[PDB]
């Protein structure tokens, strides 16, 4: 009852040039059927980039927009994003339950999915987010959230998040490669890993993706 | 310090280009600063920012609630300033490195970062509020000079002003629709942000005029 992510690998396509983003995504298409598109690409090339990716590749689209506004604005952001063809959207939990519920309501109405970001993968996440993360996760469970994002860079924290959300929830995890998270270790807890720079900055992105997949072969 | 006409910033969150341009045009004599967010940008494209500057000459604050890792924050700020935004709103909750990433790009491109410390909606009480004073102190430590705090809790807005000092610039949303009072908010904030009370009004011009009339002794 979850999205079927090919090879447990999601491409974080954060190149800001349309031609480059299209080239690299095309090059790794045989390995990946799920692409995470964020604001670096969307603010550079427009929401029609989601359309273009759909048309060009057979890929699901997760809009990594880290939605973090008041409920009224969150609703509008989700509506615009799903209208453009995103399958799912990533939403911050730290602004509270009403802000998350606004996103869930739009997703329910529009037949799409919310991913709740609990803890983040970068060093600064330790300052405020980490201390709230278990409660944000528990809040997500109470709100009926089924999809979550947690940090590969902190295996102990990722393990705890998996415990809180349960085995049935879907968990994806960034911070793999460039930020130091290990693909295999991360897949102990996450359903899929998110990988950006390790793939898209490689001299041969296809070889990079193939290499990650070979390293996790027995987990597929 | 940014000089906001009438201490009033229009939150232009209409999602149609024609309506957004028409309504902004109707209130142009009252404002010179417009806050543009994702509702309009995701619906009409980042080119709308240059169009606002071409039509109105207004300052543009990009309310993008920037809340990613430092590397991604850098890219978001670069794309946003390339589109002609004068300033960007950044969440403090993701920590100091994420804020510093934004400050670096703003310095490079001659723009400003506004640090959002406490939000105006009820859910802000769950996690943000208890971190807000510390987020503000982090802003001070980082050399942030521009801040955003909640009209809906004037005691919290006053505390934010206390932390950042009189020299810092403070703008405040939640006025009107969310219940904040224009005059009370301006006791502590340099400028108020107003969206729906203006842009959903039967007569936006009269709405803006009315707000300004209510604070005329503060201008
Ligand atoms: O806690 C998080 C949440 N999201 N991302 C996003 O995941 C991707 C990671 O890419 P990378 O492999 O190049 O580090 C980027 O798009 C980044 O904004 C994180 O890195 N950490
Ligand atoms: O703590 C915050 C931060 N930002 N905003 C933004 O300020 C505007 C408020 O508009 P309104 O007057 O229509 O409520 C909207 O764009 C909203 O996303 C808030 O309302 N509260
Ligand atoms: Cl709201
Ligand atoms: Cl930090
Ligand atoms: Cl980073
Ligand atoms: Cl709430
Ligand atoms: Mg310079
Ligand atoms: Mg008055």
From Swiss-Prot, chain A:
List the Gene3D superfamilies: Aldolase class I (3.20.20.70)
Q: Does the keyword Cell wall biogenesis/degradation apply?
A: no
Q: Which UniProt keywords apply?
A: Decarboxylase, Lyase, Pyrimidine biosynthesis
Annotated GO molecular function terms are: orotidine-5'-phosphate decarboxylase activity
Q: Looking at the UniProt record for this protein, which Gene Ontology cellular component terms does it annotate, in alphabetical order?
A: cytosol
Active site per the UniProt annotation = 66
Catalytic activity, per the record?
Answer: orotidine 5'-phosphate + H(+) = UMP + CO2
Q: What is its EC number?
A: 4.1.1.23
Xref: InterPro entries: Aldolase_TIM (IPR013785), OMPdecase (IPR014732), OMPdecase_arc (IPR047595), OMPdecase_AS (IPR018089), OMPdeCOase_dom (IPR001754), RibuloseP-bd_barrel (IPR011060)
Pathway(s) this gene product operates in, as recorded in its UniProt entry: Pyrimidine metabolism; UMP biosynthesis via de novo pathway; UMP from orotate: step 2/2
- One Pfam match: OMPdecase
Q: Which family does it belong to?
A: Belongs to the OMP decarboxylase family. Type 1 subfamily.
PANTHER family with a match to the protein in the record: OROTIDINE 5'-PHOSPHATE DECARBOXYLASE
Q: What does this protein do?
A: Catalyzes the decarboxylation of orotidine 5'-monophosphate (OMP) to uridine 5'-monophosphate (UMP).
Q: How is this protein organized at the quaternary level? A: Homodimer.
The identity of this protein, by name, is Orotidine 5'-phosphate decarboxylase
Instruction: Name its species.
Output: Methanothermobacter thermautotrophicus (strain ATCC 29096 / DSM 1053 / JCM 10044 / NBRC 100330 / Delta H)
Gene for this chain? pyrF
């Amino acid at each position: 009852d979850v999205m079927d992510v090919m090879n447990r690998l999601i491409l974080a396509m954060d190149l800001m040039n349309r031609d480059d983003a299209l080239r690299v995504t095309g090059e790794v298409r045989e390995y990946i059927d799920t692409v995470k598109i964020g604001y670096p690409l969307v603010l550079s090339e427009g929401m029609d980039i989601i359309a273009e990716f759909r048309k060009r590749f057979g890929c699901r689209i997760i809009a990594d927009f880290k939605v973090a506004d008041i409920p009224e604005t969150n609703e509008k952001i989700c509506r615009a994003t799903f209208k453009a063809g995103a399958d799912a959207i990533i939403v911050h939990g730290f602004p509270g339950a009403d802000s998350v519920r606004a996103c869930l309501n739009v997703a329910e109405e529009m037949g799409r999915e919310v991913f709740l970001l609990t803890e983040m993968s970068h060093p600064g996440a330790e300052m405020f987010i980490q201390g709230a993360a278990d409660e944000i996760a528990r809040m997500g469970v109470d709100l009926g959230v089924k999809n979550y994002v947690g940090p590969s860079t902190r295996p102990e924290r990722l393990s705890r998040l998996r415990e809180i959300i349960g085995q049935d929830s879907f968990l994806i995890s960034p911070g793999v490669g460039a930020q130091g998270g290990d693909p295999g270790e991360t897949l102990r807890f996450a359903d899929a890993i998110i990988v950006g720079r390790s793939i898209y900055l490689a001299d041969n992105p296809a070889a990079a993706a193939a290499g990650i997949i070979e390293s996790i072969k027995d987990l597929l």
